[PDB]
């Protein structure tokens, strides 16, 4: 069949005189074509009409009426799929692929006219056609990013991609990482066959290719290469000797990339790809559907759908933004300091199209700050992604100067000067009388409280914290710290600016350690405590990498200077004993001061937990095992993994209770894009309700495992009262 | 009830791979040639008493497919009631075929059984039969598959065996095997391979290099030829053994088992079967057992398999006179020699697969027959035979001279 | 000494070849699915007592290579000490794996053993492993090789079985198998195959055609599809049996065993092992034996193998309550039924491979478990199981209800 069982019709029918149908998809219930129930019923009615009228139809053209061609599917439905709904999810994707399979084996040429983006299920429809013509327009992306949500391409994506490129080329380049391609790159790898200049040339050219196909290749007209007799898969099948030699290394290399992290989506893609190549196409599609149903009904895929979709749309909508404030356009931007931060800040601010006044302690330092933007401008041209004419003109918008008179006309200041209590109040007091009175006095600050730093200016209502992340160019998160005297308009003025430079903002109330530095501290502190407990260092690095972190903790304790962590403990020991309370120091503080004593204080000082040669890390320090007697305690690895994940999760819940954050969307997104929390958990806060240990699944399972870690590793793992028994 | 005795144990000379002598000999002939010699030794034996012929073969494809044990029965003129079964337990296929043959005699349902193995690696390469562990990504990812050549380097890394330590053992194997041929210890059991005219093809384990020096072994490269040349397995093993930082690749082509052709046959039967056939029992099988350990390291199976055999036989390590473990990798033997403190005058006294070669399906029976002769030559009483099986398996066997 | 008892005997539904249900299921999963069900039936069983896992497989290539019995142990989460051996004795691979498992228990060196077989013929065709008898011209000429489909037509020609006689038996098999499913005789042993989500893939032997008529069987062509489509074998067989002038080709696709996928598992252990694990013995294995006859006719092995089992068990034909011979070819069963006068109310009472299919490596264990249930359903006492092996071999087994 072609139906699921009274929704709208999302497809318009149009036949010409020669017998070429133009299926224009126009979904009334939205601005883009989505693979929802309205589509399945509207596509099923269109597939049936093609078979009943096949005697007068010679070609088919699939077009779209929206901006984008076709994007994604119904995420609101896939996220609600319980494990008991595996039958319905299987039947739904089988219904969708059966429509595409009938469209394939129609014996008539079928062409797709990709005007805009073709992502997710959208590209899966284009792969069911015998020819694909796309338009080269800025913003058109063509890929299969289902793996980024814990899913896999279920609409024949895995089956047809492997059929076109083979197991290796399809899994590596298209399926495993959910890569999006420009219209020029898509044709270069084989996804798209031909390109055009404008979207107005799509439909007239797709039909002209059908008359060419019918007159030149009448037999092969409307027959895929894998539907022919003498078809041979590129790279071979799992039985041919060429592929069977390197096939054992496919799961091994994949585990090298994932570091043993519990992400079942890339594993399921590789199995469906290989198992699908061992049988025919229809059996491969059914196998593909079984694996897709296994991901949707899982827990990890819901954690990613919750964070990488519902939470990201909420931040770009303006959740943590005052909903009752208009728009204050920004004219000129002033950047104080031109280090590794001030240079990148001036680059992303000008790449959006804003005038920048970069100032530092000299005039030559502003050139090195502008030069770092030009070093990335070479890569912007060497990669051919920029215009080389308007892009090279964007560097003229930046005005590197040292005279404070250049800040005249600046309505937005971003102080990237180095961290010092008196230095910040001195530089800001020098520049606040030069810039406009309505200027935002942003200040990228590590852990110093804004409430104390805001006293260094007159208009404290315009003073705010705009914390970036190094490298500024690549990192997408901007942590906006709201001080006590910070006005709600200043939040909206910076919230708009962060969305203007293409980054993601979060709002943090002024607290000791803010939110990023506070939570990531517990992560490295739990690892340092393990080393002091007598645990082998290699296990700690494996525990961090297998948990899902991008960088192991001991490696991160060298990136972040180890002497920097010392005064972080001195400042918190100063913020409690001054209040009279007995300071209970973390056990990790002893391991730090022991390394500071031995002169190994991070990668900067030349040596830390690893050994460094000419700025390149080269293995762990051999003396580390003797100093801490590594090997005197071999705890279970899952206890190591759950200790680092629970600490950040438990610390995140305390940040929500203390008012540091507002919504859980800022916590999940902030922990993933800021401190590198494992994406399979869905965020430090989603890990709370999406925990899947041996004692159950959900918030209740968390508390039991937390109280189990408390009676074996310390009372610090006890859960707070907001989610208590 | 019945006790299983070994009456005969012969083998062919193991021929090298590159331009070897046995490359022209189909593996079916190697088994028939051994059956011809068992006939030449007992012309008055009633072959109808032989109820089964069990052969080990790890790659039963092409020349070795279609139940080669039955093909050897028909091509050699054996009685049609002699049966014939092929089985595969990786490297221990030859010893398991003897263990299965011994257990069939103890039950009483079989009277006299030929057992052994055959593997012509120069014609049917290793891994030609495909595999589910290595070529199905679902299970290759689930159970962390690592080729033996990396599981062996990991054993050396964990136990602290250096490149000099493993190469020192390889030199010991080349010598004792050279001393064995010089002393004539292999004269009565190694059956020379001949053609249809009677001309000689091979009469000695031609993979041996009796002039191997300690310096020549250090000049070799780490094993980067077959499956280890791929990326990934280096880091995959360290995910399981998280307390190990770096894998020390110490195994080369000189301290690993060679790739050779050959075959072996063992005649096993009950006491009344040998007396009725005018046979003299040369050894008795006391106990067999199967165990295993971590399949990622893949090569620590023999250690628990040996302790299980000694326990069932009611014996300890001191009661054994000769230890014979297959020399698949040097560190596997050194690991086995450290887990159980065993003197070198008892461990592989006549060399091993490092010098003479490792025919997969036949090695289990070959090293078994080696210990049958050395028990008589030394007039000792007991011997123990184990192997290191892929997938982390272990098979061990105790024989007793009669 | 020890007696070998059968504790469990399950199997999968046999799925057809052309557009079958189990075509998407890799043969490794079929075994794991059966191991999952043995767990679901005895959650308190100590799997460390399981010392070996023996599986039959006639084509151990690709999905079925690399010791699939060990792959099933690792992929299913069984203890690493559980071992795992693959063996091939052609069609009797499944029954020999049970016979070998039973003999290992009698010796006392193994406590509890899983046995069975697996064959996914829709993915790994018959004869994909090559062969020495059929692809080496030296031995193919020496021992006169004839495919089974011609050796079966010769049995009918010699014994005088007509095309109506063999088609009449095929109709009997289709009916008793349809009566068995209707009567629910297969409900407790046939384990439905499911996917990773729990959805059903197959729950019935879908090769069955319960509406088969006597007229529809006569409309079929003589078996000229696979190997019989070649010239030569017609005259080659008549050189051996010189007193036969013309071979009467009577076997078709309706009176020959179907080509299907499937798997089977049998749990065998000693008496103390079952009592210690809280298991109830459902049957006891009394005797096994291997014999054979002329490999040219290739399919008369079960007749001497059965007489050898009855003699060793001290029994005759009257002492048996149920006879179960594999339905590889209809004339093989009728030949077996004429050499020994056996009533049809005792021979394949629940249908056979003609209706339900013939998974090569697993059929021996499947028809074994069939007789375990039918012994309890009829409350009978003894049953006998044989098969017709290629190369003229024969394996027979007697079980006794407990």
TrEMBL record, chain A:
Pathway the protein acts in: Lipid metabolism; fatty acid beta-oxidation; Lipid metabolism; butanoate metabolism
Annotated NAD(+) 1 binding sites: 338, 340-341, 360, 417, 419, 424, 444, 446
Residues binding CoA 3, per UniProt: 71, 73, 76, 180
Annotated ADP binding sites: 637-638
All residue ranges annotated as the 3-hydroxyacyl-CoA dehydrogenase NAD binding domain in the record: 333-510
Keyword Transferase: no
Residues that hold CoA 2 according to the record: 71, 73-76, 121, 146, 180, 313
GO BP, sorted A to Z: fatty acid beta-oxidation
CC annotations in GO: cytosol; peptidoglycan-based cell wall; plasma membrane
Gene Ontology molecular function: enoyl-CoA hydratase activity; long-chain (3S)-3-hydroxyacyl-CoA dehydrogenase (NAD+) activity; NAD+ binding
Binding, CoA 4: 169, 173, 185
Binding site for CoA 1: 32, 71, 73-76, 180, 313
Positions with a binding annotation for CoA 5: 169, 185, 188-189
Residues the record lists as binding NAD(+) 2: 338, 341, 360, 417, 424, 444
Catalytic activity, as annotated: a (3S)-3-hydroxyacyl-CoA + NAD(+) = a 3-oxoacyl-CoA + NADH + H(+)
Family stated for the protein in its record: Belongs to the 3-hydroxyacyl-CoA dehydrogenase family.
Name of this protein: Probable fatty oxidation protein FadB
């Amino acid at each position: 069949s072609h139906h699921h069982h009274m929704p709208d019709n999302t497809i318009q029918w149009d036949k010409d005189a020669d017998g070429i149908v133009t299926l224009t998809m126009d979904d009334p219930s939205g601005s883009t074509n989505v693979m929802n129930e309205a589509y399945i019923e509207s596509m099923g009615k269109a597939v049936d009409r093609l078979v009943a009228e096949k005697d007068s139809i010679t070609g088919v053209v699939v077009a779209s009426a929206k901006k984008t061609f076709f994007a994604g599917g119904d995420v609101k439905t896939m996220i609600q799929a319980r494990p008991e709904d595996a039958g319905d999810v299987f039947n739904t994707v089988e219904t969708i692929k059966r429509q595409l399979r009938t469209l394939e084996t129609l014996g008539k040429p079928v062409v797709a006219a990709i005007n805009g983006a073709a992502l997710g299920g959208g590209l899966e429809i284009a792969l069911a056609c015998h020819h694909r013509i796309a338009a080269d327009v800025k913003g058109s992306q063509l890929g299969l990013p289902e793996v980024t949500l814990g899913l896999l391409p279920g609409g024949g994506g895995v089956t047809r991609t492997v059929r076109m490129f083979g197991i290796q080329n399809a899994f590596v380049s298209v399926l495993a990482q959910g890569t999006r391609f420009k219209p020029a790159k898509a044709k270069e790898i084989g996804l798209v066959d031909e390109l055009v200049a404008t979207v107005e040339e799509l439909v007239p050219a797709a039909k002209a290719w059908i008359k060419e196909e019918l007159k030149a290749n009448p037999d092969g007209a409307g027959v895929q290469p894998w539907d022919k007799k003498g078809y041979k898969m590129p790279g071979g099948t799992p039985s041919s000797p060429g592929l069977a030699a390197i096939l054992p290394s496919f799961p091994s290399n994949l585990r090298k990339q994932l570091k043993g992290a519990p992400m079942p989506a890339p594993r399921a893609i590789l199995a469906a790809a290989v198992e699908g190549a061992q049988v025919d196409f229809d059996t491969a599609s059914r196998i593909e559907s079984r694996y897709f149903a296994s991901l949707v009904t899982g827990q990890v895929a819901k954690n990613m759908m919750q964070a990488f979709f519902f939470d990201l749309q909420a931040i770009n909508a303006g959740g943590s933004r005052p909903e009752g404030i208009g728009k204050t356009p920004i004219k000129r931007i002033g950047v104080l300091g031109a280090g590794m931060m001030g240079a990148g800040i001036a680059y992303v601010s000008a790449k959006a199209g804003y005038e920048v006044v970069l100032k530092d302690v000299s005039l030559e330092a502003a050139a090195k700050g502008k030069g770092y933007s030009e070093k990335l401008e070479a890569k912007a041209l060497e990669r051919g992604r920029t215009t080389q004419e308007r892009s090279d003109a964007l560097l003229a918008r930046i005005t590197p100067t040292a005279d404070a008179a250049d800040f005249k006309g600046v309505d937005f200041v971003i102080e990237a000067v180095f961290e010092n209590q008196e230095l910040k109040h001195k530089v800001f007091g020098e520049i606040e009388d030069i810039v406009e009175p309505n200027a935002i006095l942003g200040s990228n600050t590590s852990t110093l409280p804004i409430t104390g730093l805001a006293t260094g200016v007159k208009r404290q209502e315009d003073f705010i914290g705009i914390a970036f992340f190094s490298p500024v160019d690549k990192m997408p998160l901007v942590e906006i710290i709201k001080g006590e005297k910070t006005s709600d308009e200043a939040l909206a003025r910076v919230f708009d600016y962060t969305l203007a430079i293409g980054k993601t903002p979060i709002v943090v109330n002024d607290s000791r350690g803010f939110f990023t530095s506070r939570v990531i501290g517990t992560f490295v502190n739990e690892a340092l405590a393990m080393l002091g407990e007598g645990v082998e260092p290699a296990s700690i690095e494996q525990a961090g990498s297998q948990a899902g972190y991008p960088a192991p903790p001991l490696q991160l304790s060298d990136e972040l200077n180890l002497e920097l962590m010392h005064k972080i403990a001195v400042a918190t020991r100063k913020g409690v004993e001054d209040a009279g309370g007995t300071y209970q120091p973390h056990p990790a503080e002893a391991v730090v001061e022991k390394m500071i004593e031995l002169g190994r204080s991070g990668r900067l000082k030349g040596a830390g937990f690893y050994e460094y040669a000419d700025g390149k890390r080269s293995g762990l320090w051999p003396g580390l095992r003797e100093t801490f007697k590594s090997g005197s305690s071999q705890p279970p690895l899952q206890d190591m993994i759950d200790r680092m994940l629970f600490a950040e999760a438990l610390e995140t819940q305390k940040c929500l209770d203390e008012g540091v954050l507002t919504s859980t969307a800022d916590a999940n997104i902030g922990s993933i894009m800021g401190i590198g929390f494992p994406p399979w958990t869905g965020g430090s806060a989603q890990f709370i309700v999406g925990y899947s240990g041996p004692a159950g699944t959900g918030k209740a399972a968390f508390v039991a495992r937390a109280r189990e870690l408390a009676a074996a590793y310390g009372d610090r793992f006890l859960p707070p009262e907001s989610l208590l028994s | 009830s019945e006790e299983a005795f070994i009456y005969e144990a012969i083998r062919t000379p193991r021929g090298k791979q590159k331009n070897g002598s046995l490359h022209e000999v189909k593996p079916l002939s190697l088994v028939v040639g051994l059956i011809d010699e068992l006939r030449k030794r007992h012309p008055d034996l009633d072959e109808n008493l032989i109820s089964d012929v069990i052969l080990g073969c790890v790659s039963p494809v092409g020349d070795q497919g279609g139940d080669i044990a039955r093909a050897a029965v028909l091509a050699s003129g054996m009685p049609v009631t002699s049966g014939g079964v092929q089985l595969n337990r990786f490297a221990a296929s030859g010893l398991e075929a003897v263990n299965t043959a011994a257990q069939k005699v103890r039950s009483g349902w079989d009277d006299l059984v030929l057992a052994g193995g055959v593997e012509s690696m120069s014609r049917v390469p290793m891994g030609s039969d495909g595999g589910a562990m290595g070529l199905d990504p679902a299970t290759n990812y689930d159970v962390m598959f690592v080729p033996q050549s990396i599981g062996a380097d990991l054993i050396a890394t964990i136990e602290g065996f250096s490149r000099e330590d493993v190469d020192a053992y390889a030199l010991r194997s080349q010598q004792k095997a050279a001393e064995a041929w010089s002393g004539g210890y292999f004269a009565k059991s190694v059956v020379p391979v001949r053609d249809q005219n009677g001309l000689l093809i091979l009469d000695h384990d031609e993979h041996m290099r009796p002039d191997t020096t300690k310096e020549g072994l250090a000049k070799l490269k780490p094993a980067f030829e077959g499956l280890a040349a791929l990326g990934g397995f280096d880091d995959v093993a360290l995910q399981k053994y998280h307390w190990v930082e770096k894998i020390n690749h110490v195994h080369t082509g000189g301290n690993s088992s060679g790739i050779v052709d050959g075959a072996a046959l063992v005649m096993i039967g009950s006491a009344a079967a040998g007396k009725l056939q005018g046979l003299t029992p040369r050894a008795r099988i006391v106990a067999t057992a199967t165990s295993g350990a971590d399949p990622v390291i893949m090569l620590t199976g023999p250690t628990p398999a040996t302790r299980k055999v000694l326990d069932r036989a009611g014996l300890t390590v001191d009661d054994i006179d000769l230890f014979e473990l297959n020399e698949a990798f040097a560190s596997v033997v050194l690991k086995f020699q450290k887990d159980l403190n065993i003197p070198d005058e008892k461990l592989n006294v006549n060399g091993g697969a490092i010098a003479m070669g490792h025919p997969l399906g036949a090695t289990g029976a070959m090293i078994l027959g080696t210990m049958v002769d050395e028990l008589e030559r030394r007039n000792a009483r007991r011997a123990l035979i184990t192997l290191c099986i892929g997938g982390g398996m272990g098979v061990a066997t105790i024989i007793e001279r009669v």
